[PDB]
């Protein structure tokens, strides 16, 4: 997954809980939702345990980068926590060889 709109978060959830569950590698650098998946995966503890400072920080970057409503930004943070929880299937291609 690269770049990717609001839809790719639910697509990551649909592929995270797949039959059987299958990995979702996300290449960062491009931006948009792949970068909030990456900025989760870097430092989100036990996946869905994004802490409170990140809560406000992630919700600022969602409500600013996606330009969506604040309720939708909180809701995509909850779907993000659902997807982030299974981060062992998530891999990030941090470019920079």
């Amino acid at each position: 997954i690269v770049e990717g709109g609001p839809n790719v978060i639910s697509i990551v959830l649909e592929y995270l809980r797949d039959t059987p569950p299958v990995p979702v590698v996300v290449c960062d650098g491009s931006g948009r939702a792949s970068d909030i998946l990456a900025f989760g995966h870097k430092y989100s503890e036990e996946g869905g345990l994004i802490n409170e400072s990140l809560r406000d920080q992630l919700l600022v970057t969602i409500q600013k980068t996606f330009t969506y409503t604040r309720t939708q930004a909180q809701h995509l943070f909850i779907i993000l926590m659902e997807c982030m929880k299974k981060k062992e299937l998530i891999t990030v291609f941090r470019m920079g060889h």
């Binding site: 406000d56 920080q57 600022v60 970057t61 600013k64």
Partner: peptide, 26 residues
């Protein structure tokens, strides 16, 4: 210069994040 540019890129990333958060606060 390559390793010290890795300093400047990481440090300024915190500068861009703090400026964006201060814009939300004000």
């Amino acid at each position: 210069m390559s390793m010290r540019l890795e300093e400047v890129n990481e440090r300024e990333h915190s500068m861009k994040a703090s400026l964006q958060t201060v814009d939300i606060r004000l």
